[PDB]
mmCIF file of C-alpha atoms in Angstrom:
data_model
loop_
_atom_site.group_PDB
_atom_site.id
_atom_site.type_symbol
_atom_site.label_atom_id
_atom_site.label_comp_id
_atom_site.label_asym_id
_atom_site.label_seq_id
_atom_site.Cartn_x
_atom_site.Cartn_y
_atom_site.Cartn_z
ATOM 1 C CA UNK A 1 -29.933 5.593 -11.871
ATOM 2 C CA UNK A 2 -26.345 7.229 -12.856
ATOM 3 C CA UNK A 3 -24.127 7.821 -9.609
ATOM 4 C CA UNK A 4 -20.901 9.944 -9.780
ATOM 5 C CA UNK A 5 -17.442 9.268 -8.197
ATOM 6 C CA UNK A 6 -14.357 11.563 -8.449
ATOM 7 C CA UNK A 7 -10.967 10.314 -8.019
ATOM 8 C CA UNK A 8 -7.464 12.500 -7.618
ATOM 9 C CA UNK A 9 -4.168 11.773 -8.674
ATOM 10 C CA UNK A 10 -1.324 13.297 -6.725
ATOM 11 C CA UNK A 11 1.556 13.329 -8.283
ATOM 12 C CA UNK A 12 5.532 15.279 -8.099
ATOM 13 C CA UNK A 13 8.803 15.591 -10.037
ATOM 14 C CA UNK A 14 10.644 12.561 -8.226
ATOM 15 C CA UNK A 15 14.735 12.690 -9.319
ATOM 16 C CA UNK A 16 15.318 9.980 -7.669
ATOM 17 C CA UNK A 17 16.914 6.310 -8.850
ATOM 18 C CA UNK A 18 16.078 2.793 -7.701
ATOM 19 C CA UNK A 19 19.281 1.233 -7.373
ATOM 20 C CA UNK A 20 20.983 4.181 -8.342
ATOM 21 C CA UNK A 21 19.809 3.403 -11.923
ATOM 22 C CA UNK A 22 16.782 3.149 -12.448
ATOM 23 C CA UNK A 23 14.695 6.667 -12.421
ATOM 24 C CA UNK A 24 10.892 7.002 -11.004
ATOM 25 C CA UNK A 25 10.372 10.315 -12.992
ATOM 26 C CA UNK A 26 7.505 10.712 -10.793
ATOM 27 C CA UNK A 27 5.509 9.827 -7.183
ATOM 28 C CA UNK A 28 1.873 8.659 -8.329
ATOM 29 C CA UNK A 29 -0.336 8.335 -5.076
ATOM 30 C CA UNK A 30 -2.804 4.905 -4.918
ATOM 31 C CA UNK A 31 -4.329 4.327 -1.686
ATOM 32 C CA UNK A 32 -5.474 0.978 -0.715
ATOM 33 C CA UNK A 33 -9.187 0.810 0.159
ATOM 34 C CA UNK A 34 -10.819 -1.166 3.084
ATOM 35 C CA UNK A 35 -12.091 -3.629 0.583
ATOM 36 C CA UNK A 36 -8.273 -4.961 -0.517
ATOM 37 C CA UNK A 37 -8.434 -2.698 -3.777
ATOM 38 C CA UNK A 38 -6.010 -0.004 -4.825
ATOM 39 C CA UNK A 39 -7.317 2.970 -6.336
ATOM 40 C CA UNK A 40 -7.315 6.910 -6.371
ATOM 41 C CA UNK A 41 -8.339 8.874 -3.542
ATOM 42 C CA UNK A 42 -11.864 9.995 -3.438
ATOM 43 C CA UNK A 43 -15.383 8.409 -4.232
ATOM 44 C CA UNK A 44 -19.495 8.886 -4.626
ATOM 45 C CA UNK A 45 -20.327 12.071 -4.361
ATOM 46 C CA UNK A 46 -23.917 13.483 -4.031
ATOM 47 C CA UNK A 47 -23.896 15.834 -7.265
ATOM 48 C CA UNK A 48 -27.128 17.485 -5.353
ATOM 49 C CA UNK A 49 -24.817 18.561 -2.676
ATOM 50 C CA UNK A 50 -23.089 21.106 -4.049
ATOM 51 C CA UNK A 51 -20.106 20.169 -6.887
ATOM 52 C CA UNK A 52 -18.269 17.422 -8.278
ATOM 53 C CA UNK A 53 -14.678 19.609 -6.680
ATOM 54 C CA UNK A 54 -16.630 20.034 -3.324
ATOM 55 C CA UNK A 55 -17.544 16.096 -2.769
ATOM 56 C CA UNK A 56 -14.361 15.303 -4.551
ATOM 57 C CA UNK A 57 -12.185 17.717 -1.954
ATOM 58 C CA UNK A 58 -14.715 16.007 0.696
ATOM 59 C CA UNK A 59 -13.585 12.920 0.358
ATOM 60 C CA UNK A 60 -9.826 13.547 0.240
ATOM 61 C CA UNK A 61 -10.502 15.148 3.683
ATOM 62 C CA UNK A 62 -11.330 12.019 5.027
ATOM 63 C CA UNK A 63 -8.781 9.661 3.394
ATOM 64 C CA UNK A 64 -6.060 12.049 3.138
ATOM 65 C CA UNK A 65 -6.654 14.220 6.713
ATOM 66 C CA UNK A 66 -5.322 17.790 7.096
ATOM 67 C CA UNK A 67 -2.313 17.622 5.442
ATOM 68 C CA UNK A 68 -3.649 17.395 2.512
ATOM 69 C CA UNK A 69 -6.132 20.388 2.777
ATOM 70 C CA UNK A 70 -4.015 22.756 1.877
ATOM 71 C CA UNK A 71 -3.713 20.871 -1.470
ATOM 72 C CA UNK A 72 -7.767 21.659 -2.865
ATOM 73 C CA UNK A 73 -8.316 19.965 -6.035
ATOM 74 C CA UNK A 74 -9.917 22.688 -8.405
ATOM 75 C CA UNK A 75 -11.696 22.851 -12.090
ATOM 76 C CA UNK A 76 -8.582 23.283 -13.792
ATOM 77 C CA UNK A 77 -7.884 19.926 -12.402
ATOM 78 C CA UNK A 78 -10.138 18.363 -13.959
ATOM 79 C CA UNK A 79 -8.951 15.241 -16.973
ATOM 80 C CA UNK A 80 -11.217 13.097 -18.131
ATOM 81 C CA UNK A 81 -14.481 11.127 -17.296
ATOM 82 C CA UNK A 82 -15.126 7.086 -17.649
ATOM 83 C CA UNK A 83 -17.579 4.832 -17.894
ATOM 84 C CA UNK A 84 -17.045 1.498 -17.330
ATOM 85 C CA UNK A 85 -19.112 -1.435 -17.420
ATOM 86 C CA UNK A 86 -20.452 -2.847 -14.409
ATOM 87 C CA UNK A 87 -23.300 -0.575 -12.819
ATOM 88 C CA UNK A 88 -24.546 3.062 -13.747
ATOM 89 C CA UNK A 89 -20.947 4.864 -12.405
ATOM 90 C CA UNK A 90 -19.461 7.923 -13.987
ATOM 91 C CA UNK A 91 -16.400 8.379 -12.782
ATOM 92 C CA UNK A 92 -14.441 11.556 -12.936
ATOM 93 C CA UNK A 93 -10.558 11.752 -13.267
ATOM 94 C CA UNK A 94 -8.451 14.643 -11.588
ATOM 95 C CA UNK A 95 -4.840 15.099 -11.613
ATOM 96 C CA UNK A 96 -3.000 17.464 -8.989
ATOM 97 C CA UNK A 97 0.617 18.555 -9.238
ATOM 98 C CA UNK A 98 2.182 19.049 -6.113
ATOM 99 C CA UNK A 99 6.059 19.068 -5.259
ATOM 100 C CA UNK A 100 7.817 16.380 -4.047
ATOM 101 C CA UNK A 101 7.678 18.066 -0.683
ATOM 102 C CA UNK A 102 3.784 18.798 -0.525
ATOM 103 C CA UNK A 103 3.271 14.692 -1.382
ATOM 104 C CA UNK A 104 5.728 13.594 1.255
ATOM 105 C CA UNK A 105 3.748 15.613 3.351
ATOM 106 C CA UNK A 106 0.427 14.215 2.067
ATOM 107 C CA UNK A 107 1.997 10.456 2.621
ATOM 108 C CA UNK A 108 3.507 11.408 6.145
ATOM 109 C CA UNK A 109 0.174 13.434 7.158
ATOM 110 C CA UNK A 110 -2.119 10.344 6.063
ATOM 111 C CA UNK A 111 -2.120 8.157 9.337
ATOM 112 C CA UNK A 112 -3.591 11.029 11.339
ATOM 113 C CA UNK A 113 -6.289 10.780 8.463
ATOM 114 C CA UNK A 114 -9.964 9.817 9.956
ATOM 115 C CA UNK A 115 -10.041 6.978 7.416
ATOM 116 C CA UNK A 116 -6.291 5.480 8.602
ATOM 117 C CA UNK A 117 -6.902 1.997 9.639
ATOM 118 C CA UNK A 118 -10.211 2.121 8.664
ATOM 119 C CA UNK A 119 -11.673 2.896 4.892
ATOM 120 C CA UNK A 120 -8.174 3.298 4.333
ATOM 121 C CA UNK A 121 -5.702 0.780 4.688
ATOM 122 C CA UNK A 122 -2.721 2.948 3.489
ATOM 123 C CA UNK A 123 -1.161 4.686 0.511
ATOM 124 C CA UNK A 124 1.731 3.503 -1.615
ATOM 125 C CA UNK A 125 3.039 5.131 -5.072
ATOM 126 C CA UNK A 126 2.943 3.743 -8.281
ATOM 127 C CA UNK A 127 6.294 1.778 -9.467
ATOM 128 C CA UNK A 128 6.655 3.864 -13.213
ATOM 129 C CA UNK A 129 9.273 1.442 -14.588
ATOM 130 C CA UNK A 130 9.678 -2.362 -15.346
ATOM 131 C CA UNK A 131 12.254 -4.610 -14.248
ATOM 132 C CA UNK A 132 14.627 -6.471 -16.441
ATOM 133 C CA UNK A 133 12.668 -9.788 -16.219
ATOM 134 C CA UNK A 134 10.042 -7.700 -18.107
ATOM 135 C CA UNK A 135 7.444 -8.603 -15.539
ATOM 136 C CA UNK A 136 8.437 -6.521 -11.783
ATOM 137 C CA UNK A 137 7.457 -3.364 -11.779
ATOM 138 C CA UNK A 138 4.543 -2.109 -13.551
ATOM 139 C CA UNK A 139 3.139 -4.772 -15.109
ATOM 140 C CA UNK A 140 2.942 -6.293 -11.401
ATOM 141 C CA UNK A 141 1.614 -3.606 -10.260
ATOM 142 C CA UNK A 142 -1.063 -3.680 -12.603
ATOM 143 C CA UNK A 143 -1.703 -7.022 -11.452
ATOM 144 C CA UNK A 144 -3.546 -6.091 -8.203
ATOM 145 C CA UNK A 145 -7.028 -6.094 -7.604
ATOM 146 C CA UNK A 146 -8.030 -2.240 -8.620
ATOM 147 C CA UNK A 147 -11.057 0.181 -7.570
ATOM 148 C CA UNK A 148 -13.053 0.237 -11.084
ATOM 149 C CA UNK A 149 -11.614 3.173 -13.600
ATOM 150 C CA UNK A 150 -8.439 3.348 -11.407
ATOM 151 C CA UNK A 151 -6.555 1.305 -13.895
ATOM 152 C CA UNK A 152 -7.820 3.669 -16.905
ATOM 153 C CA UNK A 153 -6.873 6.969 -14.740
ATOM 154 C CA UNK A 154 -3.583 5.702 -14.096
ATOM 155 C CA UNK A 155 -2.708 4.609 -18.176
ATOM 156 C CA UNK A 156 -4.498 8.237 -18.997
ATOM 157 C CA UNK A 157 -1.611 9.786 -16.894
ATOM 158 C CA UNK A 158 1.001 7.973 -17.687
ATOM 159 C CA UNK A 159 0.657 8.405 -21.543
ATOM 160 C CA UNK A 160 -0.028 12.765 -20.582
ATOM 161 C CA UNK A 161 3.438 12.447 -18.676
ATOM 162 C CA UNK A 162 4.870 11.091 -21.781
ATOM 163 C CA UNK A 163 6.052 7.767 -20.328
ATOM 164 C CA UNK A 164 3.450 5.811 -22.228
ATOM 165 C CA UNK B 1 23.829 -21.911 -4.183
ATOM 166 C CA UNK B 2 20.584 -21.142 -2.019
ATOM 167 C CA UNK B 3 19.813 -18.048 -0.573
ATOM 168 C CA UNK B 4 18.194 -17.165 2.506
ATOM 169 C CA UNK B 5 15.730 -14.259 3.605
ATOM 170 C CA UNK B 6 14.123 -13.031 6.802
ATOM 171 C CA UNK B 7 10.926 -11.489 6.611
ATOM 172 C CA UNK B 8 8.802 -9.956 9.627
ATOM 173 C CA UNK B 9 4.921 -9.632 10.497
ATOM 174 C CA UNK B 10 3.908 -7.256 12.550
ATOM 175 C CA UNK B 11 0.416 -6.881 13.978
ATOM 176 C CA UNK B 12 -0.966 -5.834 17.366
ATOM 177 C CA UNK B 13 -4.310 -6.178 18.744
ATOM 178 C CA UNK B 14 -7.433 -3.756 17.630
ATOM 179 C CA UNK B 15 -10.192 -3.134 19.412
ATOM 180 C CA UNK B 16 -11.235 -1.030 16.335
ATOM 181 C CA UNK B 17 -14.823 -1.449 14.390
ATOM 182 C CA UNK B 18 -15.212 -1.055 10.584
ATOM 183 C CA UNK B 19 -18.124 1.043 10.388
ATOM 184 C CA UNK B 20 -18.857 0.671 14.090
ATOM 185 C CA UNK B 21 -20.021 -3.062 13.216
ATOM 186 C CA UNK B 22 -17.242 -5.013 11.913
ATOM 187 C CA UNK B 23 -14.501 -6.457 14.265
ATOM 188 C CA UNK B 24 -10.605 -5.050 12.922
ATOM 189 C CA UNK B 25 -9.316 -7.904 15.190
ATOM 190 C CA UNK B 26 -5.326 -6.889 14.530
ATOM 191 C CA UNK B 27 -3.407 -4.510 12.677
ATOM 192 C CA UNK B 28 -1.195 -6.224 11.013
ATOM 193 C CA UNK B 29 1.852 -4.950 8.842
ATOM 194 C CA UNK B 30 2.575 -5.641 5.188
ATOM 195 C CA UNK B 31 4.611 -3.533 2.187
ATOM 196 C CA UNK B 32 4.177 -2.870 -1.380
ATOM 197 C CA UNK B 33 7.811 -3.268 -2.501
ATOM 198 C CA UNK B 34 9.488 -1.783 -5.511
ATOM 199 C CA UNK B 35 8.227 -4.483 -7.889
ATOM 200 C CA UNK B 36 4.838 -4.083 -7.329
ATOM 201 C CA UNK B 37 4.134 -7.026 -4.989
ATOM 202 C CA UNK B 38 3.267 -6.690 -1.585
ATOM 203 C CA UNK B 39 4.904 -8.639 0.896
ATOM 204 C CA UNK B 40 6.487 -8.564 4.848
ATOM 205 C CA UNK B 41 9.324 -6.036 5.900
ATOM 206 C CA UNK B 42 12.431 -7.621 5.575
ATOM 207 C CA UNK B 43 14.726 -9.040 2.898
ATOM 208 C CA UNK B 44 17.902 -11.124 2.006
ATOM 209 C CA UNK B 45 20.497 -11.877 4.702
ATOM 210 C CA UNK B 46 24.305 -12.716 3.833
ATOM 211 C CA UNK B 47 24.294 -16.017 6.391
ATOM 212 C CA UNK B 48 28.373 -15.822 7.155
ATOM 213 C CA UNK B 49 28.013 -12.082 6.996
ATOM 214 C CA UNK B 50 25.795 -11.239 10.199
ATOM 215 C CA UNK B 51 23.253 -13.734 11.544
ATOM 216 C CA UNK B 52 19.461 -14.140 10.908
ATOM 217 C CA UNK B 53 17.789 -11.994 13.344
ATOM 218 C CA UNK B 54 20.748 -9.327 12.856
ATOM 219 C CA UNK B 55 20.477 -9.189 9.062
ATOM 220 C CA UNK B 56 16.489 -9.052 9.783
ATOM 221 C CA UNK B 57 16.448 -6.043 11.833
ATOM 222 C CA UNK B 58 19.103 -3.952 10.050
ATOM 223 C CA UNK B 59 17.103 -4.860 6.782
ATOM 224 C CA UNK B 60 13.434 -3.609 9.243
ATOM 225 C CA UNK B 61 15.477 0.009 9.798
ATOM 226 C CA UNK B 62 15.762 0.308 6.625
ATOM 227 C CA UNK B 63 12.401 -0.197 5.452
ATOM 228 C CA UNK B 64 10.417 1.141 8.305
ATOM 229 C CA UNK B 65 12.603 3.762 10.017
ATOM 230 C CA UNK B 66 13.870 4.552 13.467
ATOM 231 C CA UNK B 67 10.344 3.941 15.012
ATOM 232 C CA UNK B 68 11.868 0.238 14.512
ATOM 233 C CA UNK B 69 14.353 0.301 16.342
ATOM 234 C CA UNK B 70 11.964 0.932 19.494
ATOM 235 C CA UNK B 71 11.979 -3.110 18.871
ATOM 236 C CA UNK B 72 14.058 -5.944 18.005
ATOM 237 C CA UNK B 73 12.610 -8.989 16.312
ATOM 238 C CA UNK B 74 14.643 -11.727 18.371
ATOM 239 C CA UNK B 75 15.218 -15.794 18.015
ATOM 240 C CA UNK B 76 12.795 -16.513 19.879
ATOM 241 C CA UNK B 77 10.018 -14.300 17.532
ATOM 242 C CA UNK B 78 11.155 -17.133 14.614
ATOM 243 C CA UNK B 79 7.943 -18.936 13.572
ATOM 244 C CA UNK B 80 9.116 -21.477 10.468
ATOM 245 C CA UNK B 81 10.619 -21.638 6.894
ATOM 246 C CA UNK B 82 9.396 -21.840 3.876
ATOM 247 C CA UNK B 83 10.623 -22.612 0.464
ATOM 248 C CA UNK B 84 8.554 -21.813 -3.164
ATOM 249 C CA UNK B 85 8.641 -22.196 -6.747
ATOM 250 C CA UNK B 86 11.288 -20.442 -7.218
ATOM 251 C CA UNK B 87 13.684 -21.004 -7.139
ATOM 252 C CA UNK B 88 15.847 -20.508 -4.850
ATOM 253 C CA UNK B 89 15.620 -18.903 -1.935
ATOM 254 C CA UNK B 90 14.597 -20.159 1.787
ATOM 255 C CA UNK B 91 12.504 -17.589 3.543
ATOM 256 C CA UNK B 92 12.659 -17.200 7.263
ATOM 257 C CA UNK B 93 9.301 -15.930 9.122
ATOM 258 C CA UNK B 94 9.496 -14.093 12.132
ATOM 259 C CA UNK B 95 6.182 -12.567 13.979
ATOM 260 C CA UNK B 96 6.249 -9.593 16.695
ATOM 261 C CA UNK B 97 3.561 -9.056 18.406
ATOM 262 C CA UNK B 98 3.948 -4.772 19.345
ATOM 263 C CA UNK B 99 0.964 -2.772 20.901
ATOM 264 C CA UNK B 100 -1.333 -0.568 18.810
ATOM 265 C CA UNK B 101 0.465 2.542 19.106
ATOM 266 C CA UNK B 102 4.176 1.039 18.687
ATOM 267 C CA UNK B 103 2.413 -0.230 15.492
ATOM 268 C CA UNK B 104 0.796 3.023 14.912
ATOM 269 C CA UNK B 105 4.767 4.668 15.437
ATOM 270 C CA UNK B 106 6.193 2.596 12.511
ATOM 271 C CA UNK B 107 3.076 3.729 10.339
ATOM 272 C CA UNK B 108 3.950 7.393 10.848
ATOM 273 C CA UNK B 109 7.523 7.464 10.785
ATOM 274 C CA UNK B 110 7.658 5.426 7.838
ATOM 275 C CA UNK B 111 8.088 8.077 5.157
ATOM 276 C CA UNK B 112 11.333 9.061 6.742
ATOM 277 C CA UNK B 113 12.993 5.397 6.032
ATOM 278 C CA UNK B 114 15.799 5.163 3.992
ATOM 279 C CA UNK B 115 13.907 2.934 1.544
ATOM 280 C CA UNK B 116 10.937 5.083 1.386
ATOM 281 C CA UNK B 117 10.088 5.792 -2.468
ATOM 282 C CA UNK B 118 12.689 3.390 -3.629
ATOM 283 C CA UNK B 119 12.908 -0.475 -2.041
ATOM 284 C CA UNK B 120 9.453 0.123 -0.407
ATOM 285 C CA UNK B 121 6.214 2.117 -1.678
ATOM 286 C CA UNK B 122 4.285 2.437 1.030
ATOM 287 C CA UNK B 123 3.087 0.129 3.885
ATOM 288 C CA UNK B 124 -0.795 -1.129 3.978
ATOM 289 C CA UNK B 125 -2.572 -3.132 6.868
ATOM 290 C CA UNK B 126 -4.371 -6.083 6.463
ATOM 291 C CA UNK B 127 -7.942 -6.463 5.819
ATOM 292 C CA UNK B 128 -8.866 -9.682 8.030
ATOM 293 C CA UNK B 129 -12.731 -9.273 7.977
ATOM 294 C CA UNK B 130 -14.517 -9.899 4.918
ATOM 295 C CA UNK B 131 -17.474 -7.809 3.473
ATOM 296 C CA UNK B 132 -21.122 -8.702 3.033
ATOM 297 C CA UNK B 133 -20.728 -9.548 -0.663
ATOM 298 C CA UNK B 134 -18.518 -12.125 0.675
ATOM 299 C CA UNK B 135 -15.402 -11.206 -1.212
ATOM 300 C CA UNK B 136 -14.714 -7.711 -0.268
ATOM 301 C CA UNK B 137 -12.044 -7.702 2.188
ATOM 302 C CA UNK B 138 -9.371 -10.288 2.919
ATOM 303 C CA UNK B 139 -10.385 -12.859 -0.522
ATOM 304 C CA UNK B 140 -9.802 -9.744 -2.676
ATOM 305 C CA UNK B 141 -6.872 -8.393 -0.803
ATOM 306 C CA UNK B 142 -5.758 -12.225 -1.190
ATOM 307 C CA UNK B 143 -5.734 -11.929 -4.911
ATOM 308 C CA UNK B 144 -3.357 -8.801 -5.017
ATOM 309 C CA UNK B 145 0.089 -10.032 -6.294
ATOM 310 C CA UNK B 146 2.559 -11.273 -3.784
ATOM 311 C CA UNK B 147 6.201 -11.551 -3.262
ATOM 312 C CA UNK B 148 7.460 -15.301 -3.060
ATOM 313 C CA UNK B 149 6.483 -16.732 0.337
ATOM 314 C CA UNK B 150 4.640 -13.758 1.662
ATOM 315 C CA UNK B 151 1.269 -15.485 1.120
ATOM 316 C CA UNK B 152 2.071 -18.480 2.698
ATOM 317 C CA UNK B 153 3.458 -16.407 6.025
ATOM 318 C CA UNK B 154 0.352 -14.394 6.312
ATOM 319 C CA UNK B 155 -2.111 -17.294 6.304
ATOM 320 C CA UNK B 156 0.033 -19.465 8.788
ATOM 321 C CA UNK B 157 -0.666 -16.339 10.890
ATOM 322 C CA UNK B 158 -4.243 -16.130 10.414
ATOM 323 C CA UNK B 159 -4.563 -19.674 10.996
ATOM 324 C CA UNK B 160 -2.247 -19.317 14.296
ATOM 325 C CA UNK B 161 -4.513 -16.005 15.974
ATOM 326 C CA UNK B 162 -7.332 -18.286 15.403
ATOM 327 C CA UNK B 163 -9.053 -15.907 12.554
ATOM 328 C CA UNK B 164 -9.190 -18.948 9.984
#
């Protein structure tokens, strides 16, 4: 009664500064699903069609479009796996490395995506930092209603990119 | 001592289907800004410095990009005030109705903003239906977190196309 899912994370190098201050160290992708959730791009896949990569890459197809073809999510990819609570999910963590050029092309390519204004609502990045009230920022962020394991991708990441 | 802010909601009619069986209705516009709350384009105007709908639509270019400026959110798009918790801060609400594809334009241009990656993560639509479980959809989206005021301008909306 198990099902799989596989999820990517897309992330560059970002120099940049909010304010001129503050720096992002990094552009995370989330999309926003057609059920009000944020989460990683991807999904079920069918492990009896083919691989966890193939419905994985599947998937990004869709949500993503063509832009982000040229960006296959491989093996060597591959992070983690989690199991949650709810129902009978694995759920299998990837995490791509692109330049900040590729994922502004993934972001500006997404609209023409089959899934644009439809399973998928639209992408935003991840804000890295918190805000000096302690509260904006992150710990917002984390606030939002979330695609289940989405969260736990996201903290796996963050403590791998040494911003724990 | 109070401050004010503009903020604007964009939405144009959609003849699209979820799945081919549930009714889109509208696309309508909304951001996930820099602290991790999602909220309408727009921001705090300087009152003696330019004027409501002028600080509104210079604050619009730089969130969304030069596909705004194929629009200008005038006086007579103002819909009502509103003021919080806070505090202090009265926000302004504006609504502009554009057609699918001028809505569609500010989608795909938005990655070029100035604010892009830094004031403003990404731009999402609205998820007006709600799923079969009966909280998929707009409920869930309604428990994301939300900048002051942003809320209370989306549901006046709702409540004014009639989708309440």
């Amino acid at each position: 009664g198990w099902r799989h899912a596989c999820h990517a994370l897309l992330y560059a190098p970002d120099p940049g500064m909010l304010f001129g201050r503050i720096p992002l160290r990094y552009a995370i992708l989330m999309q926003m699903r057609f059920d009000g959730r944020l989460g990683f791009p991807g999904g079920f896949v069918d492990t009896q069609d083919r691989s966890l990569e193939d419905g994985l890459n599947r998937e990004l197809r869709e949500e993503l479009g063509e832009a982000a073809a040229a960006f296959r999510v491989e093996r060597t990819d591959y992070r983690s796996s989690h199991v949650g609570s709810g129902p009978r999910v694995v759920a299998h963590f990837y995490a791509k490395r692109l330049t900040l050029e590729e994922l502004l092309a993934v972001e500006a390519g997404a609209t023409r995506a089959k899934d644009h204004g439809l399973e998928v609502l639209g992408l935003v990045r991840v804000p890295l930092y918190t805000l000096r009230d302690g509260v904006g920022g992150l710990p917002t962020f984390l606030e939002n209603s979330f695609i289940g394991s989405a969260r736990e991708q996201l903290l796996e990441a963050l403590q791998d990119l040494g911003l724990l």
